[PDB]
Design a protein around this nucleic acid. Structure first.
Ligand SMILES: [Zn+2]
Ligand SMILES: [Zn+2]
Length: 157
DNA sequence: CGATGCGGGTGCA
DNA sequence: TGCACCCGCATCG
């Protein structure tokens, strides 16, 4: 159909089950199939943290921002550093203290707010044959490394 | 260690 | 009633 939100009931003549989106931005809405393993795990390559909206039916999550090198540093091939923020709150504290992996300077956590000045949010709800997606905002800060990229660091020498 | 989900409880419109 | 958010509980890779 056309209109879509967190409404009472969601239409179900879905023919177009969008393919899993990695970087939902600009208020994107989707209809991923519920067999979609990445849609099941409510993934996003943006660092999104769980948010409690008191509703077991709508999984809401808000954007953490992105960790950058406060010293504005840039590698040799002109690469800037955007670390993926830790999701566990206490971990992000211990993280902002760690030194930059490039210029060994201090790290700074730039937060998101591409929504009326508040961290961009997402919304997941499973309605039978599929998982519906909807977000509110547009990230006003550079993209972190992916869960996949981030883990590449930690799992090294 | 942390990613993720959950939900009680708070402070502001 | 909505929304943002702090805090602890629990699971699981
Ligand atoms: Zn640096
Ligand atoms: Zn963002």
């Amino acid at each position: 159909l056309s209109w879509d939100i967190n409404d009472v009931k969601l239409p179900q003549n879905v023919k177009t089950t969008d393919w899993f989106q990695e970087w939902p931005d600009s208020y994107v809405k989707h209809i991923y199939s519920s067999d979609d393993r990445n849609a099941q795990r409510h993934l996003s390559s943006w660092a999104m943290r769980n948010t409690n909206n008191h509703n077991s039916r709508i999984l809401k999550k808000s954007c953490l921002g992105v960790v950058v090198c406060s010293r504005d540093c840039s590698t040799e091939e002109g690469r800037k550093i955007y670390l993926r923020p830790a999701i566990c709150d206490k971990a992000r504290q211990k993280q902002q203290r760690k030194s930059c992996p490039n210029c060994n300077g201090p790290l700074k956590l730039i937060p998101c707010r591409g929504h009326g000045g508040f961290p961009v949010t997402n919304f997941w709800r499973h309605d039978g044959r599929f998982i519906f997606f909807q977000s509110k905002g547009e990230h006003d800060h550079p993209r972190p490394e992916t869960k996949l990229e981030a883990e590449a660091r930690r799992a090294m020498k």
